[PDB]
């Protein structure tokens, strides 16, 4: 196996030591493989256009020997394949047909100048009069009985060669971001960009990355959310602000977590969160119907191999749930609406239900995670979070101890977080400040923030759902696996 | 100051059981669509059968009739407060002392057009959605951009342009069959251009990582794996420090095309930049003022193809009036490369000396977009060697108004890549083979500098340093 790489490195080095270049500079591609197949489709069985010369290029996936005149190569380019039929009668070169095809192995990248033809068996093909080896493949490719686990992630290029469904997998993701962007842009949004390095890295409930910026003699935090900036932009007269971009969080690596992930956040003035619900429903529905043709798609937690199947249904309207009602019915207890008390801290802690620093907000997050969240397979709205875990959401017009935040869960994971933005410069902040605050932001609020609805979504996670991948590493080209 | 008094009034209103910051005001139509809708209305007519609800920030207040100039989006609309149409308990006196300039207000009112032709809305009710607790005015505008956007509403136009620029680029490459992808911004060993990287720590892996200084190597691996045309627009992190053309964090656009040489990327860059310039402005030839407060000198950048092509050796040999040695890696050529008498002037090696010489003598001649071609192999490790002139690379740079905005080359196709520098997972990927390919990259912030006609990169950036 290694000796085969040694062997071909010998052949390539002796080819370069005889004055020949194994890695050429420029090959002219006359027609695209796709454009080739769509064209010459009118070909007949065993016809060859010898008066027409086309130049096509690609990677050799398989080599089939006929033991003489004919040698068959299956050429993969982009998403299509074309059979280059090497016939000795059509070879026009001062390379002997025998020695030449010892030079081209499987995996090698070749250009081809040849005649469009369709063989007697009907195979659409190009018959080269000349073959130029564009790149040698110095390694041994798997025999299609192989090509998995950890290796696929570390060496993505190989995975894309052997498993084209990864390629379709990512194409779908890019077409997704294209769709979302063309949607928001159709809604009058303006895509902008915010600093990824801040003095305080506001604002989200995670741990940030710390780096050092040399010019200023000071340390900076990588952004955990574009929020505070987008809101300041809303203050300045931009009514609809929109940003798709990455976010850096220091939380450990998981199947649903990556330290750096793509987040889409947008802020819309003169709307409450009840508007954003009727937006998220619309968007997710039309996106699902856009991609798969139907509103109801399957998801497999196991990995598409006889595991329990969740039947994700994106038809509007998604069911609505409260935190207090659902947790009260699940646990069978009565809670206090405003719970900033230590005496109230004993109550949440007392009702552990053996689920797992203990504060009211961390306990509540844990209680919700354990009891309410795993029930969510079909998309579900989770409404009315406390103010202790939602500092930047405006207070509820009715319940004194709740906020207008809502989350959206699909297959037991949170892909969307939104709220009605707090325009009040009297903002009470977290006392303990443990693992979870900008002076210039409150002063931006003093100039005034219109009634606003902020919204955010994990892009990689929606890609996970619509890709049917149990691991986030499958929708990321180069994940954090190490 | 004035903030103490208004926070006093708002808080004293807060202690009487009133909500100073309402939750939802239902806006019927945006101001733009309003003026566009009722521009055809007759004059001296007031429409009583139509009730519209528009909201915005009050730019100015002038006091029977009280005049508000309401700024929404990129348009303003005249709110005409008449006491005869007030439908409230207050009766027009107490109420309009509560709303000052800078306040964000909603308005439910009647479309009307005065005899003078001025289009206006007459509110029957005014709901103050947010108070402005500070006093609006008559270098810190980079620190506080929200106030800049409030006082100078036209600044938005620059950033809108940037968006409509990137969108254009996105619509261009997507028409060519390109696939927008995204690559990790954190690497153990950040490959790419020549700069200093950021060092950060990742706790889960308990290791030090480098922020990406270029999407280069990753995109090249993506091309290896069968993706023929790749492109990534995204932010990039360099530790070199702040300047007028430099910001530590800037937006870069790169694309890679298999089966293309660098002359194809030149004949493309010409095409794209031409069509985009004609798209934004009215002609291929635009103005530029490198002195912002001032007005002289005025460059006359011309985007009409074909841009001038220049070599490093020919142009620097003619400009300096001496003949250089051929492309030699050796120590001997560096002694010639000093040129202390020329006083062009850190560690000085043949590559850094050559770069400073280009920077002083050759580069300032570039006003119209100019291709600067054939850099040595000592300054271009990832560019393939020149097919004709040895010891040279197929790299080229593009300069406009004496600054570098795009860099492209024919990617090094040989896994015998000599990366030795004096003062891995990538090379093993090249062994599986990289088709003959052409890479391309561009600073987005700098093309925004040109097309916004700003001498400062902070003027095309929302929150600079
Ligand atoms: C932009 C945010 C908004 C809230 C939902 C979702 C949460 C986000 C949290 C998060 C943290 C982390 O360390 C790694 C990750 O992959 C994610 C994620 O995908 O989802 O995305
Ligand atoms: C990807 C490259 C290609 C060439 C133009 C442009 C150069 C780039 C260099 C650069 C270095 C730096 O430390 C700070 C900056 O703002 C820039 C920049 O904007 O432009 O982007
Ligand atoms: N920082 C939030 C996402 C943005 C929410 C804005 N409404 C989170 O991840 O929890
Ligand atoms: N490393 C390049 C950017 C990538 C160019 C690839 N053609 C630079 O000088 O910034």
Numbering used by the authors:
A (entry chain B): 5 to 151, 154 to 362, 370 to 449, 462 to 507
B (entry chain A): 7 to 69, 73 to 147, 156 to 362, 369 to 446, 464 to 505
Original authors' sentences:
To understand the atomic basis of KRS-cladosporin binding, we solved the crystal structure L. loa KRS in complex with cladosporin (CLD) and L-lysine (K). Crystal packing analysis showed two dimers of LlKRS in the crystallographic asymmetric unit, validating our GPC results on recombinant LlKRS. Cladosporin fits into the ATP binding site in LlKRS and interacts with most of the residues that accommodate adenosine moiety of ATP. The isocoumarin ring of cladosporin is stabilized mainly by π-π staking with Phe344, T-stacking with His-340 and hydrogen bondings with Asn341 backbone and Glu334. In addition, guanidine group from Arg563 and Arg332 also stabilize the isocoumarin moiety. Gly560 provides hydrophobic support to tetrahydropyran ring (THP) whereas the Ser346 lends suitable space for its methyl moeity. The L-lysine binds in the inner region of active site pocket and is accommodated by series of hydrogen bondings with protein atoms. The active site region and binding mechanism of cladosporin for both LlKRS and HsKRS is remarkably similar, with only difference of Ser346/Thr337 (Ll/Hs) and distant Val329/Gln321 (Ll/Hs) substitutions. It is clear that the residues Ser346 and Val329 provide extra space for accommodating the methyl moiety of THP ring, and they thus contribute to species selectivity. The drug showed concentration-dependent enzymatic inhibition and revealed IC50 values of 52 nM and 97 nM for wild type LlKRS and SmKRS respectively, while a significantly higher IC50 value of 1370 nM was observed for the human-like LlKRS mutant protein.
